[PDB]
């Protein structure tokens, strides 16, 4: 019916009203102290007062760190921007890694603006241009004005345009009998389609037929928009949207990441603060999630040390499964979790714990009931012993071949023999390594 | 056509109970790997789960790529099967993670339902009105069948499709509305006064009778990555062929995911996931593995098949050694299908099948000696020797390869063991690793 | 290796006459019903009845009397090979490319 991939049995942290975690809630089993710390972090993010707060999720493999970050994102809701990221994303061939890090920092901060739009709309009735007295004079264009007559439901207006709006109108390929949509903030024109007041069965252009827009021609409507700061920076650095030749030639060029200067960021911040002071916009800070943080270089960590001290920084969540490991880009610096000691001071470490046999068994139970499979009790005990013997994940993804082998025998029951066949057909890391050691030519 | 390395494998050779036949469908032997590949094939065909990594491991010349080709041929039509190598990720204009993201998104197909209208009939009158320069174009078309006759209106693209592929009155054309394609089926009027400008010999077709306008429902499969490249910029359809899609932003991918879910929620489109095959996956940086470990956990993720012929070797980007050249985090989230070496009867059957595909009439003793030299040396050498033995055999003008031509081909062309034997006793003739050589013969 | 059959029409332009229609439409001038073009090559001379729609191709490539042109059969699409060699001494000073008169017939089929 649905599609499932390694998650989506997790619906949140599953806490109480006081911050106490239940044993089985939200698809989580165990990890009580980590879930309580994550709930405290969720409350801190929802307070909307702090800047540049960093936590680190430190534990072994298959202990539930990405699951906890997903639960953080699900608990915060879709209004708060969440930016998932791996450590290998920051190495770009178009721009330096520092700019990619700052771009993700500004992408993790949201905004909510209520915008007023001046709108002309209607069905085009009369489209008559007027000519210039000397059109080959070198300066000045061919026409002078274009008269456009629009009609609506209980309304009809005639507009006199300068040529610049008419160039967009002509680029939209409008004619007489079309319903158009002119917005006055940027001069953009949208052509909706043919009016339904004429015949609709004599075309060959697979176009749809709309009726007349209700209300008057000239309106002022309120639109609530959700944007980020990186959208404002990107729109200002590569300007498209005007009707000047720089804007029209900006759309035709191939896009490329540039190094956005700090001056543009300060001016965008000043404009956003002026919008907030007018009661128009509101600020929604969010979370940046960086997975496999040990893949970063020493330069990226050194820039993070300065980027966390800014006054507009979001909450940063990191995760790593490393012990005493040399930092990449250095040769002798041995540090906990592969993170240098200058960053650990600005951090709050949340420690995750390994599981038990019963926790493995019930995690396999929820993963079986999410994938729409039913197993026997003895097969479940075999899977739990198998998960303790080899890995939790190997017991997790052996469920689907067992289900396929159960289906191919015309049964809707997973039994011990299907699990034995799945063992015989698929190996794990330990048995493959044991085959590799006792091999002739790297078998 | 032409003969390839795995041209004899079209399918997997499995029964209705996923049990392999000993010799079927171009595949012989390797029962456990074929059964596991059939299980993975049904896992793909169900389409209910995503982001599962499968590793195929074994010695060289065992049938890993043969297994991948059998899976691809049993997959059937309109299911994406992206086959890449590990060396293609490193590019000068794309990051490794961006190239891996594009390779992931190539393997997810979207099947879009569309509603079209087909129009066929004789053309009565074409009127085309154009500007003085020639930009603005409009006109009317009067098409006609035996029973009905209507007048349509034309646009710029329709007039462009009418002008090229020249249509006159009396020609029979077929128009598809949603594709914008005009095909000329022939001519029926046979106009007498023909200006002798062209050498047209157009076909005589009959009058189409019945309804002028007919509706039909068409289905086409598009990839996800094609939708990102199309929506990325103004001329992305050119970038689909030139490959100039440089580092598509994340906002495009988020909005495309949202619109794909919206199209699924209405019934216009459905998601058909596919198989991404990575041959020589050990030829990858550790940052690629760290990206793969977290890109396998997404909703839009295909089933990934990887092949390795490597033991405990060095992992690239690091300074330690790991099994299969892969880190243990990637090996944690993978199930492993192993492959075992062949017997003499399996090698004989392989050589007989490859001789049947290449159309070579081998003798019995020639087949026995080819099996002997394929069990002492490798299988690919004895497979390569067959065409050379055939080309030697046509020099004597007999269409049957004897053991003499096989012996001549074995004499003329060398194996690896004979090559290292010849090199290791004449080390002065060849260039040393220190760059020293002896050129003079005295 | 691709093989193809070409039907061609080349030679020096002898006459170039846009024939008018019998009943012209209102609001227009010079409504072409067809175009008469006469060709001249070595041991060959042939006049042609053509489409009205090659008149724009005549006017784009600036084809006049005395030029030697190249008419593809199916697409029309005339093009100017150059000026005939007999007009090389027409003007003291000029900037043109005079090409010899083409050999063979006006109409030929070549694979």
């Amino acid at each position: 019916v649905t599609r499932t991939a390694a998650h989506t049995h997790i619906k949140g942290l599953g806490l109480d009203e006081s911050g106490v975690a239940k044993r089985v809630e939200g698809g989580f089993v165990g990890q009580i102290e980590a879930r309580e710390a994550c709930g405290v972090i969720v409350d801190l993010i929802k307070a909307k007062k702090m800047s540049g707060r960093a936590i680190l999720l430190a534990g072994g493999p298959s202990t539930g760190k990405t699951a906890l970050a997903l639960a953080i994102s699900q608990e915060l809701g879709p209004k708060v921007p969440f930016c998932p990221l791996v450590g290998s994303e920051l190495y770009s061939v178009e721009v330096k890694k520092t700019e990619t890090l700052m771009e993700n920092f500004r992408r993790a901060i949201g905004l909510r603006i209520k915008e007023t739009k001046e709108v002309y709309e209607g069905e085009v009735t009369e489209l008559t241009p007027e000519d210039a007295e000397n059109p080959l004079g070198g300066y000045g264009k061919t026409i002078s004005h274009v008269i456009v007559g629009l009609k609506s439901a209980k309304g009809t207006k005639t507009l006199r345009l300068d040529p610049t709006i008419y160039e967009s109108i002509q680029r939209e390929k409008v004619s007489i009998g079309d319903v158009i949509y002119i917005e006055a903030n940027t001069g953009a024109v949208k052509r909706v389609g043919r009016s339904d007041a004429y015949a609709t069965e004599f075309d060959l252009e697979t176009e749809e037929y709309v009726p007349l827009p209700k209300g008057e021609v000239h309106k002022k409507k309120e639109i609530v928009q959700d944007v980020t700061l990186h959208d404002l920076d990107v729109a200002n650095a590569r300007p498209q949207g005007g009707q000047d030749v720089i804007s029209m030639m900006g759309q035709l060029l191939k896009p490329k990441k540039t190094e956005i200067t700090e001056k543009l960021r300060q001016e965008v911040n000043k404009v956003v603060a002026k919008y907030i002071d007018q009661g128009v916009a509101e600020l929604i800070p969010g979370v940046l999630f960086i997975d496999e943080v040990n893949m970063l270089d020493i330069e990226i960590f050194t820039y993070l040390n300065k980027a966390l001290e800014s006054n507009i920084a979001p909450v940063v969540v990191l995760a790593s499964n490393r012990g005493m490991t040399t930092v990449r880009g250095t040769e002798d610096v041995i540090s906990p979790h592969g993170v240098p000691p200058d960053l650990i001071d600005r951090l709050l470490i949340v420690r995750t714990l390994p599981y038990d046999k019963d926790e493995i068994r019930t995690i396999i139970e929820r993963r079986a009931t999410v994938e729409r499979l039913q197993v026997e009790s003895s097969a479940l005990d075999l899977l739990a012993t198998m998960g303790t013997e080899t890995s939790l994940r190997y017991a997790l993804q052996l469920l689907a071949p067992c289900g396929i082998l159960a289906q191919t025998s015309n049964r809707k029951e997973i039994v011990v023999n299907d699990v034995n066949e799945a063992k015989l057909l698929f190996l794990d890391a330990k048995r493959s390594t044991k085959i590799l050691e006792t091999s002739a030519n790297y078998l | 056509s032409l003969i390839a390395a795995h041209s004899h494998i079209t399918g997997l050779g499995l029964d209705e109970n996923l049990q392999p036949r000993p010799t079927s469908e171009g595949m012989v032997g390797q029962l456990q790997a074929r059964r596991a590949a059939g299980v993975i094939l049904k896992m793909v065909q169900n389409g209910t789960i995503a982001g599962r990594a499968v590793l195929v491991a074994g010695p060289p010349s065992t049938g890993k790529t043969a297994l991948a080709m059998g899976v691809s041929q049993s997959l059937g039509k309109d299911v994406p099967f992206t086959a890449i190598a590990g060396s293609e990720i490193f590019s000068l204009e794309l990051s490794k993670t961006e190239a891996l993201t594009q390779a992931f998104r190539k393997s997810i197909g979207i099947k879009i339902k569309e509603e079209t209208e087909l129009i066929e009939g004789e053309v009565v009158e074409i009127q085309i009105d154009r500007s003085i320069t020639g930009g603005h174009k409009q006109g009317k078309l009067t098409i006609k069948t035996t029973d009905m006759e209507t007048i349509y209106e034309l646009g710029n693209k329709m007039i462009d499709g009418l002008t090229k592929e020249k249509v006159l009155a009396g020609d029979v054309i077929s128009i598809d509305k949603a594709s914008g394609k005009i095909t000329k089926l022939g001519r029926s009027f046979a106009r007498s006064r023909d200006y002798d400008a062209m050498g047209a010999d157009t076909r005589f077709v009959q009058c189409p009778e019945g309804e002028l306008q007919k509706r039909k429902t068409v289905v086409h499969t598009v990839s996800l990555h094609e939708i990102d490249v199309i929506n990325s910029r103004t001329q992305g359809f050119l970038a689909l062929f030139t490959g100039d899609t440089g580092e598509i932003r994340s906002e495009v991918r988020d909005q495309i995911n949202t619109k794909v879910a919206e199209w699924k929620e209405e019934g216009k489109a459905e998601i058909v996931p596919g198989v991404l095959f990575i041959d020589e996956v050990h030829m990858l940086d550790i940052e690629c593995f760290s990206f793969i470990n977290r890109a396998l956990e997404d909703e839009f993720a295909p089933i990934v098949m990887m092949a390795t012929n490597r033991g405990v070797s060095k992992t690239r980007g690091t300074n330690y050694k790991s099994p299969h050249g892969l880190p243990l985090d990637l090996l944690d989230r993978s199930i492993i299908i192993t492959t075992k070496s062949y017997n003499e009867q399996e090698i004989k059957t392989i050589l007989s099948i490859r001789a049947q595909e290449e159309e070579v009439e081998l003798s019995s003793d020639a087949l026995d000696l080819l099996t002997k030299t394929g069990v002492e040396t490798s299988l690919r050498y004895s497979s390569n020797l067959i065409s050379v033995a055939q080309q030697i055999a046509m020099k004597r003008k007999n269409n049957t390869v004897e053991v003499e031509d096989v012996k001549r081909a074995y004499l003329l062309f060398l194996d690896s063991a004979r090559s290292v034997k010849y090199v290791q006793e004449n080390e002065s003739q060849y260039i040393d690793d220190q760059g020293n050589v002896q050129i003079s013969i005295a | 290796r691709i093989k193809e059959t070409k039907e061609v029409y080349e030679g020096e332009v002898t006459e170039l006459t846009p024939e008018d229609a019998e009943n012209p439409l209102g609001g227009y001038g010079k409504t072409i019903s067809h175009v008469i073009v006469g060709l001249k090559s070595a041991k060959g001379t042939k006049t042609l009845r053509l489409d009205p729609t090659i008149y724009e191709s005549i006017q784009r490539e600036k084809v006049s009397i005395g030029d030697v042109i190249y008419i593809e059969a199916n697409t029309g699409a005339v093009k100017r090979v150059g000026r005939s060699d007999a007009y090389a001494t027409e003007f003291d000073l000029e900037t043109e490319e005079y090409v010899p008169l083409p050999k063979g017939e006006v109409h030929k089929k070549k694979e």
């Binding site: 004619s175 004429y198 | 074409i126 009127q127 154009r130 409009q138 009155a169 | 489409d51 008149y55």
Partner: peptide
């Protein structure tokens, strides 16, 4: 009732007529 057709608006523009017996081309 029958809906009217869309108005056709071609002044100052050329015309190519392709009929059964004979073809035109009107130019300015």
């Amino acid at each position: 009732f029958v809906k009217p057709r869309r108005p056709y608006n071609s002044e100052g523009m050329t015309r190519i007529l392709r009929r059964y017996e004979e073809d035109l081309f009107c130019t300015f």
